[PDB]
C-alpha cells in the first residue's frame, strides 16, 4: 500500500496541514488494513516500514519524530486493559482526528500567541515554518502596526518564495543578505525563527544559517525566538558544535578542480545551543525553559 | 569514647565551616565495634584510587557483610541498639572522611528497609531475604545503569576521535577501555593529572595495561596541547537541585578552556546521585583535608626530600590550604549521560521527584 | 546445539503458559527467545508488562513468566503477556522451564556419544513420552523406577541408553579415622562396607578409611555422608570399640 507513495501525493498543493500530520495519517492508513488486533504481526511491520522510510529519506527530519510519537500514542492506548476491538477502533479514529487537531492547534497559536508584535516591533524572520506565517497573516487581520525584515535564504531560492507570500497580504518588505546581518541589529527589535526540529538538549535543528544569527542576538541582547507546532521533538543529541545526523555532507573538502563544478556543498543544516532561546511558542501552553526535555521524559518514562 | 581535639597546622582566615582534622593511629575506643568499619575508615582516610563511583558500592558491600555477621541478642529485639550502632558508625565515618550524597542515599535506603520489616520475624529467614533484596537493588540501579550509559556512549562516538580526559572515575575508565577493546576505532587519549590525588596517573597506568596511544599532561600545560583535538570528558560526583556540577578538583577550568576553544564538554552521571540540598558555591560545604598531601616535591608520592619546605606550625602567618570538591558552572557542560539515555543538565531534579 | 519444540505441537494455543528469557528490552516490548515452546523467538508488548521502576527489574538473563495471547498458525507470529499472569503461575512456569532444561540435558549426552543428530533423537523420544505420559522428564523417571515407557517404540541405539542410565545412577571428600579397640573388628568392617556402598571406597592406611560421596545436585551429598557416619557408629557399638569422625 506504501507510505512513500502517500507522501509523494501532496507537492504543489500542501500549505495547510502539517507534514508530520500527513505522515501520521499515512501510517494510520497503512495500519487499518492488516488487522491491528495482533501486536506480533503489526508493530514489527510498522517499525520495518519506518526504517524503510528513513532509508529512503532525501532531506527530512520530522518524519522520525512523528512516527515515534505515533508509536508512543499506540503504547499509551493499550493500558486500559479492557477489550481489543474498542481500543483498536479508537486508535483507528485517532488518525484523522489527529489531523483535525492540528488545525485547532494552529488556530489557538494564531489567536493567543501573537502578542509579541504590537508596538511597531520590527521582526527578523528566517527559516520557513507555516505556523509563523499563519501568525503573521492572522496578525494583519487585527490591524496592528508592524514591520518585516527578510534575511535571504538560499537552499534553492526559498527567500524569493517567502517574499512572494508576503506580497499577497500587501505588506512593506526589504531584503537583507546574511553577511550584512551583523551590521543591522539597531532598528530591528526581535529575531523570530521557524525550526525543522527541537533537540533533546533544548537546541534548535534548522536550515542554511541560524547559529551565527543566534550568536549575533546573544551579542546584541535582543531576544531570540522560535515558533513551531508542538510535534517536533526527536530523540537526537547534537553533542558538539558541528555534528548532526545529516543526509548531506558535513563540510567536504573537494579536490583541486578546474572547470568550477564542485563548490556548492555548504552547510544547509545548522544547530544552536540551548541557552539562546528566550521564548518558544507552542500550542500546548506557553512553555520554554526546559519544557521539551520534560515532555520527552514524560513520553519515555526515563 | 573515642578521641577529641588536637589539630595539626594553621586554621587559616578564610574557608572555615567543614571538618578538616581525628584518628589516624588508633588509641582507646569502645569495645563493641566491628573491625571492618574501622578498616574501611582507615582506607578511605588514606585512599588514592576511589572517586565517587566505587565508594558507595564498597559501603554497600561492608553493610552486607555486617548483616551476614549480625546476630540478634536473646533479650532485646533485632532493632533496639542496632540504630545506635549505625549512628556510631556514621559518626566514625564523618570523623574519618565526610559522607557523600551517594552514601546519604544508601543510608536513607537502609532506614527505609528497617522501617519496612517490623520486629516480629525470626533471624535466619529475615536477613536471608534482606541480603538478596539488597543485592538485587545493587544489580538494578548501579551496574545495569552503568552498562546502559556505556552503550549510550558507544552510539554517540563517531569516526576519528582525539579526547582529553580527567579523573579516577570508574565509568570513564570502563568507557575508554571499551573503546580500546571492542569498538576498534581511531581513539586517542590525553590525560590530565592533579596534585591532591594521583588519579590521572592511575588512568594512564590502566590505559597502558590495555595498550592505548597515550599523551600525558597537567593543569598548567593546556595552551600548547590543542595546537585536531575535539572531545572533552569529565567525571561528576553529584548534581544538585540548582543544576550546577558539584564534582572533584580540576574540572571546571578544563571545561572553561574547552568552551573558549570552540568544542563543548560532555559529563557522565548516575540516576541516584541527585540531591535536594541547595548550594551554588564551594564555600558552603567542601571536602577539606590535611596539608600533608601538598608536601612531596613532584616526581612520585614516596620520595621524601629535604629541600626548601617542611614546616607548618613553626611558621609565623602562613596559610597552606587546598580544596578537593568544586562547584562548576551550569552552562558550560552540554551533554549529560544518565539513566534516561540523553538530556540537559538544566533538568536538575526531574529524577528526584520521580524517585 | 539447541533447537526444536519441547511439546508435540510447534506453535502454542490460547491461554497456555510459557517462559521467556529476555536478552534485550525497551523499544516495542521484547522479541526474545522462549524456553518452553521452541527456541524460536516470540514477542511481548510494553502494555501488559507493567502491573504495579520497570526498566531495571528485567533487562538481561533474569527469568520472566509469560502467557500466550494471540497465535498466527500460518507463518509464525506469537503474542505474549506478563500482566495476565498471577503470583501462582510464577513458580509453575519456572518449574516447567526447569523440566524442559533437564529434558534438554538428557538429550545432549546421547547426541555427543553416538555422534548422531539431536533433532532425530528428539523425534524418536517425543511421541510415547510427551503425548501419552505427559512431560518427558517424568516419563524418564518412571522408566528408571520401572521400565514400561521405552518398550513402546524399538530403540536404534542401546549403548546410548545404557550411558544415560549410568548417568542417572560430584564427589565429596570424607575421612573416617577408625581406631577400634574391639575383639572382632574385621567382620564389623566388612558389614560396614556392605551397607555404605549400596559410594567409592579406597584404602591407603590401616586406621584411615577414604570415601568419596557421590552427589546428584550438590546439596544431596550431606544426607548420604551423615547416614554413612551413623551406620559406622552403629557398627562398632555392639562389639566394643570406637570410631572417630572429623
XYZ file of N, CA and C in Angstrom, chain B residues 196-275:
240
model
N 46.270 16.829 44.544
C 45.788 16.151 45.767
C 45.741 14.618 45.683
N 45.266 14.091 44.553
C 45.216 12.648 44.303
C 45.738 12.320 42.909
N 46.597 11.304 42.831
C 47.144 10.833 41.558
C 46.150 9.930 40.825
N 45.143 10.581 40.247
C 44.051 9.935 39.521
C 44.433 9.772 38.049
N 44.976 10.854 37.486
C 45.423 10.886 36.092
C 46.457 9.811 35.832
N 47.411 9.701 36.754
C 48.478 8.710 36.672
C 47.894 7.296 36.641
N 46.931 7.060 37.529
C 46.253 5.776 37.620
C 45.558 5.434 36.304
N 44.879 6.439 35.748
C 44.175 6.309 34.477
C 45.155 5.903 33.368
N 46.295 6.590 33.353
C 47.354 6.343 32.381
C 47.846 4.902 32.480
N 48.058 4.464 33.720
C 48.510 3.109 34.016
C 47.517 2.084 33.468
N 46.237 2.357 33.722
C 45.163 1.488 33.265
C 45.159 1.381 31.740
N 45.335 2.530 31.090
C 45.393 2.609 29.637
C 46.542 1.755 29.095
N 47.693 1.890 29.751
C 48.896 1.145 29.398
C 48.641 -0.356 29.494
N 47.981 -0.758 30.585
C 47.593 -2.145 30.818
C 46.670 -2.717 29.723
N 46.073 -1.840 28.912
C 45.262 -2.242 27.759
C 46.028 -2.142 26.435
N 46.830 -1.084 26.288
C 47.636 -0.851 25.087
C 47.066 0.237 24.196
N 46.985 1.451 24.744
C 46.405 2.616 24.057
C 47.481 3.692 23.847
N 47.361 4.445 22.751
C 48.220 5.605 22.477
C 47.886 6.760 23.424
N 48.819 7.059 24.329
C 48.571 7.988 25.441
C 49.518 9.195 25.438
N 48.914 10.383 25.424
C 49.585 11.634 25.767
C 49.282 11.959 27.229
N 50.284 12.470 27.941
C 50.160 12.760 29.370
C 50.502 14.220 29.670
N 49.532 14.928 30.249
C 49.638 16.364 30.524
C 49.134 16.736 31.927
N 49.226 18.026 32.257
C 48.799 18.558 33.556
C 47.837 19.746 33.409
N 47.474 20.355 34.540
C 46.552 21.502 34.594
C 47.173 22.758 33.963
N 48.484 22.928 34.150
C 49.225 24.084 33.624
C 49.424 24.025 32.107
N 49.877 22.872 31.612
C 50.134 22.670 30.185
C 48.835 22.402 29.421
N 48.237 23.479 28.911
C 46.988 23.408 28.142
C 46.955 24.318 26.914
N 47.775 25.370 26.931
C 47.849 26.348 25.839
C 48.488 25.783 24.564
N 49.357 24.784 24.730
C 50.107 24.177 23.622
C 49.557 22.821 23.160
N 48.791 22.160 24.031
C 48.275 20.802 23.786
C 47.222 20.719 22.659
N 46.479 21.808 22.452
C 45.460 21.886 21.400
C 46.064 22.050 20.005
N 47.168 22.794 19.924
C 47.886 23.026 18.670
C 48.966 21.977 18.426
N 42.084 19.595 15.408
C 42.689 18.274 15.559
C 42.160 17.540 16.795
N 42.151 18.235 17.934
C 41.639 17.698 19.200
C 40.207 18.202 19.402
N 39.288 17.275 19.677
C 37.857 17.591 19.739
C 37.207 17.369 21.114
N 36.892 16.112 21.431
C 36.059 15.747 22.584
C 36.740 15.951 23.937
N 35.953 16.388 24.921
C 36.402 16.535 26.313
C 35.392 15.835 27.232
N 35.898 14.939 28.081
C 35.074 14.179 29.025
C 35.493 14.385 30.480
N 34.493 14.511 31.354
C 34.705 14.722 32.792
C 33.901 13.736 33.648
N 34.338 13.559 34.895
C 33.664 12.688 35.861
C 32.980 13.476 36.963
N 31.659 13.296 37.070
C 30.832 14.011 38.048
C 30.642 13.231 39.347
N 30.519 13.972 40.449
C 30.243 13.404 41.770
C 28.739 13.393 42.068
N 28.099 14.558 41.926
C 26.667 14.750 42.193
C 26.136 16.027 41.538
N 24.881 15.976 41.090
C 24.179 17.153 40.560
C 23.108 17.598 41.562
N 23.139 18.888 41.895
C 22.263 19.486 42.908
C 20.891 19.873 42.338
N 20.039 20.446 43.194
C 18.706 20.932 42.807
C 18.738 22.169 41.899
N 19.879 22.857 41.878
C 20.099 24.021 41.016
C 20.435 23.630 39.577
N 21.225 22.566 39.428
C 21.690 22.089 38.123
C 23.191 22.222 37.919
N 23.866 22.834 38.893
C 25.314 23.048 38.859
C 26.098 21.765 39.127
N 27.271 21.660 38.502
C 28.122 20.475 38.610
C 28.973 20.507 39.884
N 28.522 19.771 40.901
C 29.245 19.637 42.166
C 30.137 18.393 42.109
N 31.365 18.590 41.631
C 32.307 17.494 41.380
C 33.672 17.714 42.051
N 34.673 16.945 41.616
C 36.035 16.984 42.164
C 36.835 18.235 41.749
N 38.158 18.178 41.925
C 39.061 19.335 41.781
C 39.137 19.977 40.381
N 40.108 19.559 39.568
C 40.402 20.215 38.291
C 39.514 19.785 37.142
N 38.306 20.351 37.085
C 37.348 20.048 36.016
C 36.838 21.337 35.390
N 36.495 22.280 36.263
C 35.816 23.495 35.866
C 36.676 24.325 34.919
N 37.950 24.458 35.281
C 38.918 25.195 34.481
C 39.044 24.579 33.091
N 39.131 23.248 33.065
C 39.228 22.492 31.819
C 38.020 22.759 30.930
N 36.846 22.730 31.558
C 35.582 22.982 30.876
C 35.580 24.371 30.244
N 36.039 25.345 31.029
C 36.128 26.733 30.593
C 37.029 26.846 29.362
N 38.173 26.168 29.442
C 39.151 26.151 28.362
C 38.527 25.590 27.083
N 37.795 24.490 27.252
C 37.109 23.824 26.152
C 36.111 24.774 25.486
N 35.357 25.474 26.331
C 34.363 26.445 25.888
C 35.027 27.541 25.055
N 36.158 28.030 25.563
C 36.947 29.057 24.893
C 37.425 28.599 23.508
N 37.990 27.392 23.462
C 38.483 26.783 22.225
C 37.413 25.933 21.524
N 36.307 26.601 21.179
C 35.224 26.088 20.311
C 34.376 24.919 20.836
N 35.001 23.754 21.013
C 34.291 22.480 21.212
C 33.845 22.267 22.676
N 32.526 22.024 22.900
C 31.936 21.822 24.240
C 32.363 20.537 24.976
N 31.850 20.373 26.200
C 32.224 19.283 27.118
C 31.049 18.324 27.358
N 31.365 17.045 27.580
C 30.376 16.027 27.956
C 30.727 15.348 29.283
N 29.740 15.267 30.177
C 29.911 14.704 31.528
C 28.927 13.545 31.755
N 29.375 12.519 32.484
C 28.551 11.347 32.813
C 28.134 11.320 34.285
N 26.904 10.862 34.537
C 26.333 10.784 35.891
C 25.307 9.652 36.041
N 25.142 9.169 37.274
C 24.176 8.111 37.600
C 22.812 8.666 38.031
N 21.790 7.807 37.983
C 20.407 8.178 38.318
C 20.050 7.930 39.797
N 20.980 8.291 40.682
C 20.811 8.184 42.137
C 21.626 9.268 42.856
N 22.558 9.875 42.121
C 23.486 10.889 42.642
C 22.844 12.257 42.925
N 21.613 12.455 42.447
C 20.887 13.725 42.587
C 20.504 14.042 44.033
N 20.658 15.313 44.407
C 20.444 15.775 45.784
C 19.395 16.881 45.904
